[PDB]
Major capsid protein 10A
Amino acid sequence: DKLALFLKVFGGEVLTAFARTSVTTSRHMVRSISSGKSAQFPVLGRTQAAYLAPGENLDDKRKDIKHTEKVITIDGLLTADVLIYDIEDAMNHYDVRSEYTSQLGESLAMAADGAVLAEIAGLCNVEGTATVIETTQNKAALTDQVALGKEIIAALTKARAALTKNYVPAADRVFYCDPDSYSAILAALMPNAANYAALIDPEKGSIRNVMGFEVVEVPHLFPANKGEGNVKVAKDNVIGLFMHRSAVGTVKLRDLALERARRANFQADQIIAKYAMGHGGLRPEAAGAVVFK
Amino acid sequence: DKLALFLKVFGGEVLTAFARTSVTTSRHMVRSISSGKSAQFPVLGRTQAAYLAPGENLDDKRKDIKHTEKVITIDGLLTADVLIYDIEDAMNHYDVRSEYTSQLGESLAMAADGAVLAEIAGLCNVEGTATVIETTQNKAALTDQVALGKEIIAALTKARAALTKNYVPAADRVFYCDPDSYSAILAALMPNAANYAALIDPEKGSIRNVMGFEVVEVPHLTAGGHVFPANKGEGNVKVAKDNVIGLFMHRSAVGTVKLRDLALERARRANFQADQIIAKYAMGHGGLRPEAAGAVVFK
Amino acid sequence: DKLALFLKVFGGEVLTAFARTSVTTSRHMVRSISSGKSAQFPVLGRTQAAYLAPGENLDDKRKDIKHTEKVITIDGLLTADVLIYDIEDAMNHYDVRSEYTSQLGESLAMAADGAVLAEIAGLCNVEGTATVIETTQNKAALTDQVALGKEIIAALTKARAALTKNYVPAADRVFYCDPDSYSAILAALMPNAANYAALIDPEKGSIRNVMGFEVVEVPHLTAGHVFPANKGEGNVKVAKDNVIGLFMHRSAVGTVKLRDLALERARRANFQADQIIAKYAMGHGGLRPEAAGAVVFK
């Protein structure tokens, strides 16, 4: 009854608290399904429109490609929720519900950050096709803000060149970047220069297309240890990780779901959201980084 | 009758007059209690791995943590007033009636200012834990606009370092600064091109987002809890007052509750020949989970 | 026939797929040829006139006219389509239908834009017609966004020079560039604010004019028709490996097409195949060798 009405309202806030805040909902394909617990999407062998003379209908390059498309399915459930002490939620209004929704949204954003990064990183160090473009000389020679951002741009240019080299389209290609040290990529471009308009963003927190791709910055300074040991893509040794649209995969189950109950052990009230089905899946290309070594 | 009516319009007048010089209403966290003396605020849970591949449940390692609502309550009734000698009454309205509304309101805010300031000063001064940045040069090397405009921005970077690397909901946040500083930074922005009138912000009485954060420059920075060794040059505690301007925060790192709108009334005393007014406010000042705090330093 | 109707609906949705994509869609000559395969556009060489009583003769000046006329022929098909394995159909709605639409669209629009740009950039070497603009410095020392960004304008003074002195309707026109330098422009274009709201026509997907022209940067002029990029010089100074510098204007060029875009498909089963087919006509450059010039680095 009344609890029921109070809920539905809570669920709507949670959905928005997610959609508002994330590194995602973009920068990848997503879809809906019903009791299918799986999914499929095509990758890109690209395509173009050549001069066509009806002495022949080519349908040829399409033979010589031999590139299939790896569908996927949902593995496990990613959601987590919490325990409370009940009384406020009915009635009152602005303070309590509003306070809970934001935290849930933050949690959703963190979850979104966790999965995509992992799928990309763990795709291939494993032997574009692979990744590595590094140079920069092992961080030891240069700790300086000026000494960074120069050598960083060149690596990105090299990566774009490799991409034409390995093809794939170039439009929205990403380059997720670390939370910091891009102060260099700031402090490199324009010295002095308050200037922080121009180089831009509304509606999001990005920067604009320096040497292709774009700039998004996040936490998560995949193997949390291994320096090389075969596979190169790794923990703190690693920066970069530029992937591209539709190189990865996931699905939904439904819009969302949640329910509540009580557990005598911790008493009063327990809210849980069974929702956020999708697990990231990565298709090779793009997906490359720079470490130090 | 007439007097009561005047008082009633009053309350309205100064009510709407409060929020004006008020540095913060929104861009912060608050609640309206019902009869409560107190309240409690969940800092809650944000990191969730959510990898559910069946085993156990939420476990005791998750049971071992704080996450405890720092409860909170009033510090005792917080309100102030000023004595008058009444002539104007229901005549000479608008001007000269407004003078008292004024004299009270900005103060009613004025304490709350340092209050939300006081919590910030308290927050990282005791020995996560968001933090500072230092100089690029000593106080004596601080002279003109050109210099003292820029180093602010130089600080801003590694100021964002804490904002980011420490996670937090990157959406909405505010920076607090002083007119001496406010001047400087904005002077670093546009020495060229006329006047800050060109900045299209002021309708919201604010600063449209600069690099990071948002800008609200302070009037004062001296109230109480100040409770922190403001007076002391250092005495360790480099977080102190009048070393620097660099205090900053983010939303939901503090905030508190209050009681049932705002009311007041008056009465005479006649010990000395007058009739004086008393406002009554609840508020209180809540602390909360540490994050997004610190400063620049002059040393 | 329900599936066919759904396909028709998808085709209708696409149109858009071409629409929002293309840099150059409008802002150029387009004509609808019907049942014929081609067409030709008059250049009208434009001598002035005079007034004459005693001559009563049109002749000499009628010799001096220099009227040239040129045609474009039509190619023969340029279109690009995809293979798919139908599953969801009228289900798995919205999304993943749309996917393929966007996919074939951006590709088609892109190819067309690339082609027009290509026609214009080589457009011209004999051995305003002339007046490409050059350097102001060696691109080596170019560092920041405003470093190369400021000189742009300084060049566009001369661009204005070329836009006028050769006559032409200075009314409406466009400076085609590549997403790399938009910033470089916008920096010294608008260090002041955050006028973007007041800075008009961002919401139409463009930039209100710098001195003359208009500002456009879309998909990486490259790939690559073909103009002699690789050549350092080897005469033909207008080549790539240099810049974004094409100057040209509204009604500089353009051509025709046959009755929008059509489509149909069926099974194949060679490899389990039902794969969609779009069609097109389009065409290419010609048309008033006097439009543009370029910038460069040297």
Notes: The first helix of chain B runs from residue 2 to 21.
